[PDB]
Amino acid sequence: SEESQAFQRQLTALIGYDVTDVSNVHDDELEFTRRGLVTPRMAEVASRDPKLYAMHPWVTSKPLPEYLWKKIANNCIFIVIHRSTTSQTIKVSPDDTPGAILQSFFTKMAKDFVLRVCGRDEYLVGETPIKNFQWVRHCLKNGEEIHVVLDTPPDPALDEVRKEESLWDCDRKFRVKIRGIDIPVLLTVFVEANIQHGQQVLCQRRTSPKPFTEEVLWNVWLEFSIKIKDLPKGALLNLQIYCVQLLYYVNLLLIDHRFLLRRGEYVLHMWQISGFNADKLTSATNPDKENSMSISILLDNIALPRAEMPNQLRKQLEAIIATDPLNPLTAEDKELLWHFRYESLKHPKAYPKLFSSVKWGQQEIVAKTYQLLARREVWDQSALDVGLTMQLLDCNFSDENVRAIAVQKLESLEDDDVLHYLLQLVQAVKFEPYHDSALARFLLKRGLRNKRIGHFLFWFLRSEIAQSRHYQQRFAVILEAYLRGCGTAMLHDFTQQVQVIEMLQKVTLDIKSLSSSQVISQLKQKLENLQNSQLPESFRVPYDPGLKAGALAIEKCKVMASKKKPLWLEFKCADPTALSNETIGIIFKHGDDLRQDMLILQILRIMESIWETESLDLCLLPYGCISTGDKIGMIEIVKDATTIAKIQQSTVGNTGAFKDEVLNHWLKEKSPTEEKFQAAVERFVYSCAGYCVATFVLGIGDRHNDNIMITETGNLFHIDFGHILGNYVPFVLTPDFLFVMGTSGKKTSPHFQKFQDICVKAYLALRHHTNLLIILFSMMLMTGMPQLTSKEDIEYIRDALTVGKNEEDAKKYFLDQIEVCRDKGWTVQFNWFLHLVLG
Ligand SMILES: COc1ncc(-c2cc3c(C)nc(N)nc3n(N3CCCC3)c2=O)cc1F
């Protein structure tokens, strides 16, 4: 076709990568994965209720928390239904199905149609009680009204999808022939060949070192110790170059996507080393065929197809099944898990440890391991454990089958929870030995089934494609698959968004180079230009798919006085049904890898829902933060907020003679009444408690004053998590914070004691999820925070969470942390100043 070759040029512009391209490949895997993905894409498209998918109701099925019940005066929810200019407040009960509120509106008045949210693109369709809509729970949580605009449902037509048009037999020890290396531009140098499987080295060999020149030959055959028949699927040939110090590396999947052993000549362009992480595992070769080191090799020139237990041993097994994810396994622990594998199968918590005790380098062991996977009755039975599920998905498990069972346990996640783990699940795609996987397809299905998950899946993939050459290819094939089944409706919004963001980026990069108030000239000037025959009517806010941004409030926009020059943008809600005029404040920025920030903000959301299991509310503000390309993205602006440093700075800048009372005054200054003031003190006790715990666990507690904000309503929140991570006292409980809790240097108080009891109850609450937090944190550092791995960096969280210790021993560990915070005063703060704001 041709109207199918225009559609191709378009997708490539949204992907930010040219998929169909074949200049940096050495096989049909990616092309093969595209073909393989046509069926999962089509099956989900052909199975999604057209209407329900057009309206994407945002429903949860979790019990309404205690705090939102104590927020319902009398089983009576006040929904304000607005038509044209009319308004009608109605009385609804926590089980009033949305559609059933029509027989409560057409019966409750007189003298087909769906409810939408005012200003938002957030419908209230489907067979669900109102107490199960995030929008509703968000109205009740922050003591707000419930505005609805009765209007015509969207038409599923706009969601139109464009019409789619033997190895176990040779005891031959494995061998690889090194032809040689050749860097186009420059010591001693040797090749290192490893046969790996799930971060587990099966065999190693090297080559006699030779002088480091523009071309280095060898013509050697490296005979490994692994029989051809013993090579597990997912096994990688990892080639490295030392001088001893590492310089280059590349990977080749010994068994391919067709289950055939690799044969023939290979010229691979090797990735460099800068100056552990997920990039080091890629099957992708360097696209930069010029600068980059190369390697020539050759492959051979074969397809792949109950008793009792003592008591001391039982207690030895249990001691191991209990140990946290990061606690290592002795060869003794492993032989133990393996010998009692059948007793280890009855315990789902044993799976990551038992499957890590398997010598994958042996055909017969894997054979029994699969016979073990056949007796999954217990695993399949057990309730879904995300902490356990994520574990079988990390860098430690390269076997297709083990991983698949974990993905199989994910199928039962409702849309609400997919959104909580989407970002990490997408980052987990980097651990997949193959381009096509149960996980890659799962994200595709979940992405196509619901518009919200799909909108977020897009940016997550888009972000990775634009700043990772190690994984862009695999991701590009996944995004393309998604874009060919999301519909023309969404295919259109992603176009508006890409257009809008790309114009703004250009403005950031240029205003960045031209550096005063003279700069304000261009900023205002360029912003008005783009506001014409460019910037389309309105785009969806990327970090909040519900919001639409209209015209650019030029007057409010500016450049910030930071090291780099991020823009401070403001837009009118492009939707008239809006209950206000409050603009949409977005911070635009180039110069930082915003992915680190996304990961942290996402862990913050996981913590809130962990605290929702225990009917708690630590009042955090995990504001929206979307990376949109190479070292660039946007950041939501919290309305009515200032830096804690700015509240101090009022009375001195060049000094910082930190007055232990300015904060409490500021709150009263901003509080309309004195009564609301107490609620702003209330919200402070909680938000300050939340970030104290969370920040401490994540080990980002040592914050530099500037990087802490407060709402004119009591909510406290840290910001700029990208800082403390991009360069590398417990948390932050300064005398001015404590002065809002009625205390000084050394004393107690009613409000303070409460603070200290919200913390311990939140700290221990997180410990009931040790394994989960450890996996996320460990999985976070590996895939998004290079130069923050080493191993010793991963093990920080083991101590923060106080592993081993009973609840009672931990409570007195956190309380002491709260103490190391008082015996410090402003030493810390004043010290940041002597530095950040100086040297
Ligand atoms: C990753 O990098 C970032 N992370 C965070 C910010 C940042 C968020 C921010 C928010 C969410 N709300 C409000 N009301 N001000 C903000 N703000 N202010 C502007 C100036 C100093 C405070 C911010 O700087 C900016 C970054 F660049």
Curated annotation (Swiss-Prot):
Alphabetical list of Gene3D superfamilies matching this protein: 3.10.20.770, C2 domain, Phosphatidylinositol 3-/4-kinase, catalytic domain, Phosphatidylinositol 3-kinase Catalytic Subunit, Chain A, domain 4, Phosphatidylinositol 3-kinase, accessory domain (PIK)
Domain PI3K/PI4K catalytic: 553-826
G-loop, as annotated region: 559-565
Residues that bind ATP: 585-594, 620-628, 717-725
GO cellular component assignments: cytoplasm; cytosol; membrane; phosphatidylinositol 3-kinase complex, class IA; phosphatidylinositol 3-kinase complex, class IB; plasma membrane
Signal sequence extent: none
Enzyme Commission number(s) of this protein: 2.7.1.137, 2.7.1.153, 2.7.1.154, 2.7.11.1
Domain C2 PI3K-type: 170-300
Compartments reported by the entry: Cytoplasm; Cell membrane
CDD domains, per database record: C2_PI3K_class_I_gamma (cd08399), PI3Ka_I (cd00872), PI3Kc_IB_gamma (cd00894)
Effect listed in the UniProt record for changing residue 703 to P: Abolishes protein and lipid kinase activity. Does not abolish interaction with GRK2
PROSITE patterns, per database record: C2_PI3K, PI3_4_KINASE_1, PI3_4_KINASE_2, PI3_4_KINASE_3, PI3K_ABD, PI3K_RBD, PIK_HELICAL
BP GO terms, sorted: adaptive immune response; angiogenesis; cell migration; cellular response to cAMP; dendritic cell chemotaxis; endocytosis; G protein-coupled receptor signaling pathway; hepatocyte apoptotic process
Domain PIK helical as annotated: residue spans: 306-485
Reactions catalysed: a 1,2-diacyl-sn-glycero-3-phospho-(1D-myo-inositol) + ATP = a 1,2-diacyl-sn-glycero-3-phospho-(1D-myo-inositol-3-phosphate) + ADP + H(+); a 1,2-diacyl-sn-glycero-3-phospho-(1D-myo-inositol-4,5-bisphosphate) + ATP = a 1,2-diacyl-sn-glycero-3-phospho-(1D-myo-inositol-3,4,5-trisphosphate) + ADP + H(+); a 1,2-diacyl-sn-glycero-3-phospho-(1D-myo-inositol 4-phosphate) + ATP = a 1,2-diacyl-sn-glycero-3-phospho-(1D-myo-inositol-3,4-bisphosphate) + ADP + H(+); L-seryl-[protein] + ATP = O-phospho-L-seryl-[protein] + ADP + H(+)
Entry-linked SMART domains: PI3K_C2, PI3K_rbd, PI3Ka, PI3Kc
Cystine connections: none
Biological function: Phosphoinositide-3-kinase (PI3K) that phosphorylates PtdIns(4,5)P2 (Phosphatidylinositol 4,5-bisphosphate) to generate phosphatidylinositol 3,4,5-trisphosphate (PIP3). PIP3 plays a key role by recruiting PH domain-containing proteins to the membrane, including AKT1 and PDPK1, activating signaling cascades involved in cell growth, survival, proliferation, motility and morphology. Links G-protein coupled receptor activation to PIP3 production. Involved in immune, inflammatory and allergic responses. Modulates leukocyte chemotaxis to inflammatory sites and in response to chemoattractant agents.
The protein's name: Phosphatidylinositol 4,5-bisphosphate 3-kinase catalytic subunit gamma isoform
Organism: Homo sapiens
Gene: PIK3CG
